[PDB]
Amino acid sequence: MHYMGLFSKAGNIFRQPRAMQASNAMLQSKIFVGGLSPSTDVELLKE
Amino acid sequence: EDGTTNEFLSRFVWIMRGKVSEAYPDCDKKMIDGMLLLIVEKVVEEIERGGFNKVGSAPPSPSSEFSDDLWATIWEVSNTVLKDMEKERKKEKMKQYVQSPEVMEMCRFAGEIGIRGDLLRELRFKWAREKMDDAEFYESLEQQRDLDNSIRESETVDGEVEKRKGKLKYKIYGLELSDPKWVEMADKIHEAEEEADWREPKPVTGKCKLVMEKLESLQEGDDPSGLLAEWAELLEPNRVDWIALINQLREGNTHAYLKVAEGVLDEKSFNASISDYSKLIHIHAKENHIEDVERILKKMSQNGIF
Amino acid sequence: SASDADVQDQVSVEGKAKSRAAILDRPSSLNALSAPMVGRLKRLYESWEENPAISFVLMKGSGKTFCSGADVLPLYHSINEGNTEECKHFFGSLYNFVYLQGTYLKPNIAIMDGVTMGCGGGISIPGMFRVATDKTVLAHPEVQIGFHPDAGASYYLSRLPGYLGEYLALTGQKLDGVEMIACGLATHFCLHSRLGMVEERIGKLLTDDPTVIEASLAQYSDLVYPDNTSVLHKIEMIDRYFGLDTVEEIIEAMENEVADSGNEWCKKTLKQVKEASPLSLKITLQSIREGRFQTLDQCLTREYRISLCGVSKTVSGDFCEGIRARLVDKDFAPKWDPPRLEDVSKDMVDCYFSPATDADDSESELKLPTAQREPYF
Amino acid sequence: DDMKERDDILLEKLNAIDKKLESKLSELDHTFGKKGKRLEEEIRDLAEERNALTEKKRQPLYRKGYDVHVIDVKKVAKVTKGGRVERYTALMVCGNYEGVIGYAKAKAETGQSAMQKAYEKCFQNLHYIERHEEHTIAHAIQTSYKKTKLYLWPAPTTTGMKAGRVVKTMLLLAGFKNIKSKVIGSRNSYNTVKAVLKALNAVETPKDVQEKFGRTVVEKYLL
Amino acid sequence: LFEKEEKELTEVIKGPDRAFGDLIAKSGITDEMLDSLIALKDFQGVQGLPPLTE
Amino acid sequence: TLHGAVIQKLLNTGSHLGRRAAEHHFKQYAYGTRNGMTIIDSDKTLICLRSAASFVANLASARGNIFFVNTNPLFDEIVELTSRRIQGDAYNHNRSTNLWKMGGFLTNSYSPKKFRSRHKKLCFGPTTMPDCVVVFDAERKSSVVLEAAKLQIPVVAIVDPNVPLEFFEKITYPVPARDSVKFVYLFCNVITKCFVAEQMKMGI
Amino acid sequence: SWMKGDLLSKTRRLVGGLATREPVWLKAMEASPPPVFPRSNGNLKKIVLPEDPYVRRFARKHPEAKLVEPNKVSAFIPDPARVYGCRVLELTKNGISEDDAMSVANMEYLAERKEKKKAYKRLKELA
Amino acid sequence: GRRILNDALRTIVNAERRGKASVELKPISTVMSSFLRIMKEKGYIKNFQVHDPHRVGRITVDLQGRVNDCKALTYRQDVKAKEIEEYTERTLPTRQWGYVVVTTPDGILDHEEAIKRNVGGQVLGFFY
Ligand SMILES: [Mg+2]
């Protein structure tokens, strides 16, 4: 195969899109407990 | 219509020159050319006075400038042109009417039955022939209708009121690129492909194979100018072809490798940039040729680059 | 049998769902045809036409060469041992195969992935579909060997636009795939690296409609335009310098131009013309300027007449001379029986185009089953 | 040719009703009050009319020349707090003696209505089976569906069909004439029907071998 | 502005264009022609969709 | 070559950047793996695009009915304009925005409907069975592929690198790409231009 | 059903035997068949460039450097690391020691940074 | 030889069902190469190449999706020239498609050629 291997010898065409980079930043041990995160979700996030 | 008139004339000028060269063998080519000019004037006069139908109906009385046998030859030659034209058109119509889909499904049923070989070919040709016959009856009726409508309209509106050819027209896959913006797009695509080092070397086919087989057999001190001009006449090298020869000669012979680059140091088709100067000074700093380093610096500073 | 095992390996057959492909497998002589190869291909193509269970057929070459032409060294040795029947049987078989390809009743597809010379284009270029790769090279160096562009090459070269057929046949100028598809010889173009895609997309079509086959080939093909260095851009020079009657007008007008305004293209055309045998040039020019107005069978008939005259040594030994000096001695300096071109008159070039069937010998005329095939090309 | 125009007039009435319904639904958003209520009632009446028209396009059709046979009628029961709820299921097959075969299964409350429902749906799942010279299969075939293993063998032209009730009825309706068969394992009738349809479709014809391998497949007596 | 433009173009250069392979930028082929090259059919007198900015 | 320019237009649309961990049936379209992505081959994207566009255009001579299904809010207007141009006066905005939510809207297209309230608006089924279904569902919110496979209808849809085998095997015309806004516009533009060019050949 | 084959072949086999009526889409599917592509051995090759090791440190070198994507540019204008790697590939291309090539690329990158800075200073001067 | 022969044949079938393109077999044998040559002649594999056959062999085979099952017998089975057809009618599952490959004094043949040559031997296996 020819053309894609040509165009790899060009500018930076392997750039992550905004959605994928935003999910990477969304992801970046264990978690908060249920009785703690439920208290946070009971106080806040009602807006 | 322009095609068949031009092809009638093109066949006619081919055959009547050979008939005149024998009818009047003492006549030289200039008198033949004059007679051909007069005959081609009067045959198009014949077809404007009465069309192609009069040319195949009955021989008329000739003019006084030529004898009767010359007009007899003109008649026979025109008829043998007419038969050739009609035969070529009949064969090209049978060509598509063989593979028209109705005949295709008839032959498909025949092959599923078991009729195979010469009988299948014979029946296919008969069915194509019947398709051609029905098409020609339909076109006869269509032309009669068209002519009657034209003459009816003409009577009503009268009663109501008071050699050389050459051209390229690019067409690929049934798509026309005949506009000059397409050749401009092609130019601006090919130059960028050249620029980005994405062009490929030409295949080394035929005589050029033994030339590089000789270039890998070149000796120390041999002047490669004659073989280099021979190769530049054969394969018309660009920058990519040049560097491909350079890179294959790097494995072919190292002393012949050092000869060629030196020889080329100034060619525009090589597109000598700064990288070639740097590689050629570093390889001779490696190979310990200080005078050759001075020579390449001289031919570098000659072009105003310091 | 047990005697045919070499020819079975020389012409390999590949089977697909509804198609059969003949593959030329001669790496020693670069796919140069022989009489067994042409006879086997004729039998295979006749059976594939006769079979209703096969929808289209294909022709491929293996290696870096599609077909370099025919075997002339075997004909040279056969002439040197005295007889001519082997050459006669070879020529009639090859021209019959070309006629069958030109009047073939099914789609035929010819792949060109390399060099093509001589009858290697005559066996393919009358086909219904021609696919050219980037490595494809098409050339006609018969005038350097002393022969004429036989095997129907006087048909598709004569039907090129302009005087390009005269230019290519006389000068032996090579062509590219883009130039072939510009001239109209090649129907489709595709790269070398993308060949396995197209060669199996065609492999698993279960259709017989030429529109479907053409659209599949176009969809899997490539999009190209000729460059500024293409031959067709100089078609006005081709018309201006190759449009006269005799070869002497052409060479003298070109010499006058190259002397006056020093155009390098006329110099390279001079170098191309001067190598060839001077008897063959008039034969080839008369052949193209006659076969522009004749059909495929008539072109094959007078090509066979020229061939059977030129292998009998009626007036010259240019054929054997060029073959021996370009294949056997390899000195690259052959000496022709007319050492110049002006001494060649109308008599000996009429002796090439002569109706030798009038000499009461039917075996000197090519036979063709024209009533049974009912030809249409 | 009256079927086509009978469908066409229903199509035109449906298109007109759709346009009127769209026109009223466009105005319901901006209309408030008793005018909105009367538009709601008019829309409901139009919906009733369009439901009545679209019910009429459901005319089931059978095909002439086809034969339909009953393979199985069972009485199945469901337990509720008031007793046993008993229903009926029927399994039916159909075929035209020329290679087309189909089957259906249906459940109703009565033994006649179960057969009627399966008779309606018998023509919607139809397969085509390839035969060799219109009397036998191309080669022997063995296949299994769950625990029902089925073997079929071809036979010469004056042998006859050697099969049980379900397999014999299915092959007779498909159009076979000289086949020997054997059912090994469980002999559930519904699984037997499914295993027969698996075997009859797993058979490779000589044309299929020809297409798969690109060679020529020749009968041996034509050699 | 003449003094502004040349000095605004020295935050550019050492390869002002770059994009060694940007065929649309280097050439001038239009989106109608590109859509004509796709699908292998001529598109004259053919009104398709409004522009994406619209 | 012009082909290298067409391919970079496809690359400019952003349709060559898939997601990680492609399935087994997608490595025949894939090219490599870089920066946590599967790179789709633009050559095969173009070939699949040409096949799909040719089929959609070739339906016009046979006078077929094409059904569009879109489940993404990002491509509302492009699919709306494409469906308005192709389907013509027989276009229903309520149906084209709400009917794909109903389960069994094709296998049961003759079931009765009832008017209740403002609701999500009332829409019946199609009177005529469609001949082709063009899908823009990547989150697989609707059962349209399953119903079309049950009812033997060709499906033109754009396939992700993480498509299941069960959904993939029922798709007749796969177009391997990432459905960005530019590529969705380009796809719909090719479809609309091909269909109207076919329509003009019959004088309409 | 229990037939084998894909949509076109199954439908063709069904309509040949007079089981079903011919659907409308059959002719369009025959005129434009679906695409096919050859077998792939299930293996995806990780695409790599020769400039990759020089790109690596380039985030340590000139520490963090340019970013031309948040600054949504185009997928053709190189990104600092790419131009630095191209220079050192063609630099080292000519023999030149590896570390010396890194030094002479580092010096020209920093001279470019000074040139950019004085361009911004003259921007503020004519602002 | 029987263990490695059945090993390579089951590798071939297992990789056919996954829709792959090439397989690699190691260890190899001359009997295995001749068996693969018979498969190539009958059109069940496209090509096969043998690498380093006298020190450490490896065989690369290219597949196309045409073979259903390959077996190699794990026991001794004699056959005469006049028992070949009756044995073939009971060995192949379909009794029509498939070839039984036996080894003979004349070489490693299939069952149709050995009838013509009138020579029997040991049954190696079959493919269909
Ligand atoms: Mg039991």
Q: Chain B within 8 Å of F4 (Cβ-Cβ)?
A: yes
H113 Cβ neighbours under 8 A, 6+ residues apart: none
Q: Chain C within 8 Å of B191 (Cβ-Cβ)?
A: no
CB contacts < 8 Å between F and G, how many?
75
Query: Coil, strand, or helix at residue F20?
Result: coil
How many angstroms separate the most distant Cα atoms in chain E?
Answer: 49
Touching partners of C (3+ C-beta pairs < 8 Å) = A, B, D, E, F, G
Report residue C4 as tokens: 């045919």
Query: Coil, strand, or helix at residue F192?
Result: helix
- Name every chain A residue with its beta carbon within 8 A of the beta carbon of B196: 9-10
Find out whether B188 and B228 touch, Cβ atoms under 8 Å: no
For F:69-88, CB contacts with B below 8 A are none
Closest CA to D70 of D115, D111, D109, D117: D115
Closest CA to C63 of C119, C25, C110, C15: C25
Measure in Å the smallest separation between the Cα of G73 and chain D Cα atoms.
Answer: 45
Alpha-carbon distance B261 to B259, whole Å?
A: 6
Q: Chain G within 8 Å of H19 (Cβ-Cβ)?
A: yes
Amino acid at C28: S
Q: Chain A within 8 Å of B200 (Cβ-Cβ)?
A: no
- Name every chain B residue with its beta carbon within 8 A of the beta carbon of F9: none
- Provide the 8-state DSSP code for B293: H
CA angle F122, F125, F130 (to 5 degrees): 145
Q: How far is the CA of D185 from the centre of ligand 1 (A)?
A: 6
Residue corresponding to tokens 């020349």: D65
Query: Coil, strand, or helix at residue D102?
Result: strand
- Name every chain F residue with its beta carbon within 8 A of the beta carbon of A14: 17, 34-35, 37, 39
Alpha-carbon distance B62 to C238, whole Å?
A: 40
In the sheet that C115-117 helps form, which strands lie side by side, from edge to edge?
C65-67, C115-117, C137-139
Do B125 and C374 lie within an 8 Å CB cutoff?
A: yes
Chain B contacts to E (CB-CB under 8 A) = 173-176, 184-185, 188-189, 191-192, 195-196, 198
Find out whether F136 and F72 touch, Cβ atoms under 8 Å: yes
Alpha-carbon distance F129 to F125, whole Å?
A: 9
The residue of chain C nearest to residue D207, with distances taken between CA atoms, is C53
Determine whether H29 is exposed, middle or buried from the number of CB atoms within 10 Å of its CB (0-12, 13-18, 19+): middle
List the determination method.
Answer: cryo-EM
- Provide the 8-state DSSP code for B168: -
Alpha-carbon distance C22 to B241, whole Å?
A: 34
Q: How far is the CA of B13 from the centre of ligand 1 (A)?
A: 95
CB contacts < 8 Å between A and F, how many?
39
Alpha-carbon distance D124 to D170, whole Å?
A: 17
Is the Cα dihedral A33, A34, A39, A40 positive or negative? positive
Alpha-carbon distance D55 to D49, whole Å?
A: 10
Q: Chain H within 8 Å of D54 (Cβ-Cβ)?
A: no
Residue corresponding to tokens 């299930």: G42
Which is it for strands F66-70 and F132-136: parallel, antiparallel or unpaired?
parallel
Residues β-bridged to residue F30: F40
- Name every chain E residue with its beta carbon within 8 A of the beta carbon of G123: 7-8
Which is it for strands C11-15 and B175-176: parallel, antiparallel or unpaired?
unpaired
Alpha-carbon distance C264 to B251, whole Å?
A: 33
Q: What are phi and psi of F175, to 5 degrees?
A: -120, 100
- Determine the length of chain B: 306
Dihedral angle at the C-alpha atoms of B147, B149, B155, B157, nearest 10 degrees?
Answer: -130
The C-alpha R_g of chain B, in whole angstroms, comes to 35
Find out whether G32 and G62 touch, Cβ atoms under 8 Å: no
Alpha-carbon distance D122 to D106, whole Å?
A: 10
- Name every chain F residue with its beta carbon within 8 A of the beta carbon of E49: 78, 81-82, 85, 185, 188-189, 192
C232 Cβ neighbours under 8 A, 6+ residues apart: B168, C164, C179, C182, C183, C226
For D:110-139, CB contacts with H below 8 A are 138-139
Report residue F141 as tokens: 């919110």
Alpha-carbon distance D210 to H66, whole Å?
A: 12
Q: How far is the CA of D199 from the centre of ligand 1 (A)?
A: 21
CA distance to B260, F46, G87, G117, per residue, from B217 (Å): 13, 48, 36, 56
Find out whether F33 and G14 touch, Cβ atoms under 8 Å: no
Q: How far is the CA of D148 from the centre of ligand 1 (A)?
A: 10
Find out whether C317 and C337 touch, Cβ atoms under 8 Å: yes
Dihedral angle at the C-alpha atoms of F194, F195, F198, F202, nearest 10 degrees?
Answer: -160
Alpha-carbon distance B118 to B136, whole Å?
A: 27
For G:97-126, CB contacts with E below 8 A are 112, 115-116, 119-120, 122-123, 126
Helix pair C85-102, C73-80: axis angle to 10 deg: 150
Question: Helix, strand, coil: what percent of chain G each, to 5?
Answer: 50, 0, 50
DSSP secondary structure of E1-54: -HHHHHHHTTSS-SSSS--TT-HHHHS---HHHHHHHGGG---SS------S--
Alpha-carbon distance C187 to C35, whole Å?
A: 29
Do G76 and E18 lie within an 8 Å CB cutoff?
A: yes
Do G33 and C216 lie within an 8 Å CB cutoff?
A: yes
Q: Chain B within 8 Å of F35 (Cβ-Cβ)?
A: no
CA distance to F66, F67, G23, per residue, from F131 (Å): 6, 8, 8
- Name every chain G residue with its beta carbon within 8 A of the beta carbon of E22: 74, 76
Alpha-carbon distance C101 to C91, whole Å?
A: 15
Do B118 and C372 lie within an 8 Å CB cutoff?
A: yes
Measure in Å the smallest separation between the Cα of C125 and chain F Cα atoms.
Answer: 25
Measure in Å the smallest separation between the Cα of A3 and chain F Cα atoms.
Answer: 7
- In angstroms, the first-to-last Cα distance of chain E is 33
Facing residue for E49 by CB, picked from F8, F188, F194? F188
Alpha-carbon distance D200 to D173, whole Å?
A: 13
Residue corresponding to tokens 């109308």: C346
Find out whether C178 and C224 touch, Cβ atoms under 8 Å: yes
Closest CA to C248 of C341, C346, C352, C343: C341
Residue corresponding to tokens 């050759």: B292
Find out whether D136 and D178 touch, Cβ atoms under 8 Å: yes
Alpha-carbon distance C114 to C67, whole Å?
A: 8
Q: What are phi and psi of G65, to 5 degrees?
A: -125, -155
The C-alpha R_g of chain C, in whole angstroms, comes to 21
Is the Cα dihedral C271, C276, C282, C286 positive or negative? negative
Q: How far is the CA of D149 from the centre of ligand 1 (A)?
A: 12
Find out whether A13 and G76 touch, Cβ atoms under 8 Å: yes
Alpha-carbon distance B25 to F106, whole Å?
A: 87
- Provide the 8-state DSSP code for C33: B
Alpha-carbon distance C255 to C108, whole Å?
A: 45
User: Alpha carbon C105 to chain centroid distance?
Assistant: 21
C118 Cβ neighbours under 8 A, 6+ residues apart: C67, C68, C69, C70, C140, C141, C142, C149, C151, C153
Q: Chain E within 8 Å of G90 (Cβ-Cβ)?
A: no
- Determine the length of chain F: 204
Dihedral angle at the C-alpha atoms of B93, B99, B103, B109, nearest 10 degrees?
Answer: 160
The residue of chain B nearest to residue G94, with distances taken between CA atoms, is B279
Do F51 and C225 lie within an 8 Å CB cutoff?
A: no
- Name every chain D residue with its beta carbon within 8 A of the beta carbon of G4: 201-202
Report residue F30 as tokens: 């894939």
Touching partners of H (3+ C-beta pairs < 8 Å) = D, G
Find out whether B42 and B50 touch, Cβ atoms under 8 Å: no
Helices (H), G1-127: 7-16, 25-31, 52-57, 81-91, 98-125
Report residue D68 as tokens: 């339909």
Q: Chain D within 8 Å of F94 (Cβ-Cβ)?
A: yes
Find out whether F123 and F100 touch, Cβ atoms under 8 Å: no
Residues β-bridged to residue B53: none
Residues β-bridged to residue C109: C58, C129
CA angle D52, D57, D59 (to 5 degrees): 120
Alpha-carbon distance C252 to C258, whole Å?
A: 10
Report residue B273 as tokens: 């940039």
H or E element: which one contains D128? Answer: strand D126-128
How many beta carbons lie within 10 A of that of residue C86, not counting itself? 15
- Determine the length of chain H: 128
Resolution in A: 3.0
Helix pair F181-200, F76-87: axis angle to 10 deg: 10
Alpha-carbon distance F62 to G27, whole Å?
A: 8
Query: Coil, strand, or helix at residue C70?
Result: strand
Q: Do chain A and E touch: 3 or more Cβ pairs under 8 angstroms?
A: yes
Query: Coil, strand, or helix at residue G90?
Result: helix
Is the Cα dihedral C15, C20, C26, C27 positive or negative? negative
Measure in Å the smallest separation between the Cα of G60 and chain A Cα atoms.
Answer: 19
Alpha-carbon distance D122 to H32, whole Å?
A: 53
Do G41 and H18 lie within an 8 Å CB cutoff?
A: no
Helix pair C264-274, C164-171: axis angle to 10 deg: 60
Q: Chain G within 8 Å of F10 (Cβ-Cβ)?
A: no
Residue corresponding to tokens 């107005």: C293
Facing residue for D51 by CB, picked from F94, F112, F121? F112
Measure in Å the smallest separation between the Cα of A18 and chain B Cα atoms.
Answer: 29
Report residue C68 as tokens: 């370099």
Closest CA to G1 of B251, F25, D197, F49: D197
